[PDB]
Scaffold this active site. Structure first.
Site, PDB file in Angstrom:
ATOM      1  CB  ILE A 207      -0.923   0.036   1.238  1.00 48.07           C
ATOM      2  CG1 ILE A 207      -2.102  -0.916   1.031  1.00 48.07           C
ATOM      3  CG2 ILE A 207      -1.397   1.457   1.505  1.00 48.07           C
ATOM      4  CD1 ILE A 207      -3.082  -0.935   2.184  1.00 48.07           C
TER       5      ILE A 207
ATOM      6  N   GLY B 238       4.461   3.692   5.140  1.00 46.40           N
ATOM      7  CA  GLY B 238       3.873   4.543   6.155  1.00 46.40           C
ATOM      8  C   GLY B 238       4.934   5.225   6.996  1.00 46.40           C
TER       9      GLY B 238
ATOM     10  CG  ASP C 196       1.624  13.593  10.689  1.00 47.80           C
ATOM     11  OD1 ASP C 196       1.810  14.732  10.204  1.00 47.80           O
ATOM     12  OD2 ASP C 196       2.101  12.557  10.188  1.00 47.80           O
TER      13      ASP C 196
HETATM   14  C1  MFP Z   1       0.911   6.269   3.724  1.00 42.52           C
HETATM   15  C2  MFP Z   1      -0.145   5.386   4.387  1.00 42.52           C
HETATM   16  C3  MFP Z   1       0.034   3.976   4.491  1.00 42.52           C
HETATM   17  C4  MFP Z   1      -0.964   3.164   5.122  1.00 42.52           C
HETATM   18  C5  MFP Z   1      -2.153   3.755   5.662  1.00 42.52           C
HETATM   19  N1  MFP Z   1      -3.222   2.903   6.365  1.00 42.52           N
HETATM   20  C6  MFP Z   1      -3.026   2.710   7.855  1.00 42.52           C
HETATM   21  C7  MFP Z   1      -3.913   3.204   8.844  1.00 42.52           C
HETATM   22  N2  MFP Z   1      -4.631   3.604   9.665  1.00 42.52           N
HETATM   23  C8  MFP Z   1      -4.504   2.344   5.700  1.00 42.52           C
HETATM   24  C9  MFP Z   1      -4.710   2.403   4.302  1.00 42.52           C
HETATM   25  C10 MFP Z   1      -5.939   1.841   3.738  1.00 42.52           C
HETATM   26  N3  MFP Z   1      -6.204   1.882   2.277  1.00 42.52           N
HETATM   27  C11 MFP Z   1      -5.371   2.449   1.219  1.00 42.52           C
HETATM   28  C12 MFP Z   1      -4.640   3.579   1.562  1.00 42.52           C
HETATM   29  C13 MFP Z   1      -3.806   4.174   0.673  1.00 42.52           C
HETATM   30  C14 MFP Z   1      -3.667   3.675  -0.617  1.00 42.52           C
HETATM   31  O1  MFP Z   1      -2.781   4.322  -1.472  1.00 42.52           O
HETATM   32  C15 MFP Z   1      -1.841   5.332  -0.985  1.00 42.52           C
HETATM   33  C16 MFP Z   1      -0.953   5.903  -2.084  1.00 42.52           C
HETATM   34  O2  MFP Z   1       0.345   6.177  -1.531  1.00 42.52           O
HETATM   35  C17 MFP Z   1      -1.521   7.163  -2.790  1.00 42.52           C
HETATM   36  N4  MFP Z   1      -0.599   8.336  -2.846  1.00 42.52           N
HETATM   37  C18 MFP Z   1      -0.441   8.897  -4.219  1.00 42.52           C
HETATM   38  C19 MFP Z   1      -0.881   9.388  -1.837  1.00 42.52           C
HETATM   39  C20 MFP Z   1      -4.401   2.527  -1.030  1.00 42.52           C
HETATM   40  C21 MFP Z   1      -5.275   1.899  -0.091  1.00 42.52           C
HETATM   41  N5  MFP Z   1      -6.850   1.275   4.548  1.00 42.52           N
HETATM   42  C22 MFP Z   1      -6.579   1.254   5.859  1.00 42.52           C
HETATM   43  N6  MFP Z   1      -5.476   1.741   6.452  1.00 42.52           N
HETATM   44  C23 MFP Z   1      -2.302   5.175   5.537  1.00 42.52           C
HETATM   45 BR1  MFP Z   1      -3.830   6.073   6.214  1.00 42.52          BR
HETATM   46  C24 MFP Z   1      -1.314   5.973   4.913  1.00 42.52           C
END
Ligand code: MFP
Length: 285
Positions: free
Chosen positions: A10, A13, A120
């Site tokens: 994903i 983080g 944050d």
């Molecule tokens: C940087 C980051 C990494 C993980 C999460 N967490 C943890 C918690 N609490 C999620 C994600 C999710 N779904 C999803 C989230 C982003 C995603 O894509 C992110 C890409 O990085 C897009 N960018 C261009 C911003 C795809 C599915 N469902 C549940 N929890 C988050 Br908030 C931010």
């Protein structure tokens, strides 16, 4: 972990890598985060599993095995950042912007009522679904400068009291961050894209005016406040977020008050006239 099968990454983080995974047993699809374990951490995290709200990404389970920590969250298909980028040339429709701000304020009012701050908030940790809902993610995990991947942590949404070295900031910090996000959704451009702590502070000053004892009692005594800070004049919000209407500018201004004590609360913001005609539109994903 044997109860989980990694589907895809994903993203990197703040506190570790996150993978889309499936419960080799339940079939449940989740977001699996491996935290980069202190007893104080376990207790605090366990408290988060209790902080359940429709606008807060659900923490399904906390797994503490092999002396490692894994957080299993509900899975949403996209964050607000990707949506804002995909809506860059057209702009997110006002009704949807209003709906998202409204829902996020409901989430914040909930957390804040329980004395929990996010600390944050940013577009990357605000998740949306095809139904029109938006949720706060990574809530409470704060209580680093770079991520485990050395990626720089964004300062664009940090409240001025934090930048000025305040050690005991309040729920007001989340309202500031959301205000910055509100403005960005409306204008399609970051409000304060600082690339260093001082650049961030000076960007805020250049727009809202360099704070003084008049607008923010006690500011000149803050840890990192410097009498040598340049003195910039404040600009009109009419120039900051056009073409947002007066109700919208009224609310944004109260969310961006310098003094944390004067900054509007989540609950008071929910009663603001801006939400008189709020609805729940379906986003174009
Ligand atoms: C940087 C980051 C990494 C993980 C999460 N967490 C943890 C918690 N609490 C999620 C994600 C999710 N779904 C999803 C989230 C982003 C995603 O894509 C992110 C890409 O990085 C897009 N960018 C261009 C911003 C795809 C599915 N469902 C549940 N929890 C988050 Br908030 C931010």
């Amino acid at each position: 972990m044997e109860n989980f099968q990694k589907v895809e990454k994903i993203g990197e983080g703040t506190y570790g890598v996150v993978y889309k995974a499936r419960n080799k047993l339940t079939g449940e699809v989740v977001a699996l985060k491996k935290i980069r374990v202190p007893s104080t951490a376990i207790r605090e995290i366990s408290l988060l599993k209790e902080l359940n709200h429709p606008n807060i990404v659900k923490l399904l389970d906390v797994i503490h095995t092999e002396n490692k920590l894994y957080l299993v969250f509900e899975f949403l298909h996209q964050d607000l950042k990707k949506f804002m980028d995909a809506s860059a040339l057209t702009g997110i429709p006002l009704p949807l912007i209003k709906s998202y701000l409204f829902q996020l304020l409901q989430g914040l009012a909930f957390c804040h009522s329980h004395r929990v701050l996010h600390r944050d908030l940013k577009p990357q940790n605000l998740l949306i679904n095809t139904e029109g809902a938006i949720k706060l993610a990574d809530f409470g995990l704060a209580r680093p400068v770079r991520t485990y991947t050395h990626e720089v942590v964004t300062l664009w949404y940090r409240a001025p009291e934090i930048l000025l070295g305040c050690k005991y900031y309040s729920t007001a910090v989340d309202i500031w961050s959301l205000g910055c996000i509100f403005a960005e959704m409306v204008t399609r451009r970051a409000l304060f894209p600082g690339d260093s702590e001082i650049d961030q502070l000076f960007r805020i000053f250049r727009t809202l005016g360099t704070p003084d004892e008049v607008v923010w009692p006690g500011v000149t005594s803050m840890p990192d406040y410097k009498p040598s800070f340049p003195k910039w004049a404040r600009q009109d919000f009419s120039k900051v977020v056009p073409p947002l209407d007066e109700d919208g500018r009224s609310l944004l201004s109260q969310m961006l008050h310098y003094d944390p004590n004067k900054r509007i609360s989540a609950k008071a913001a929910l009663a603001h006239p801006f939400f008189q005609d709020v609805t729940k539109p379906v986003p174009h994903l």
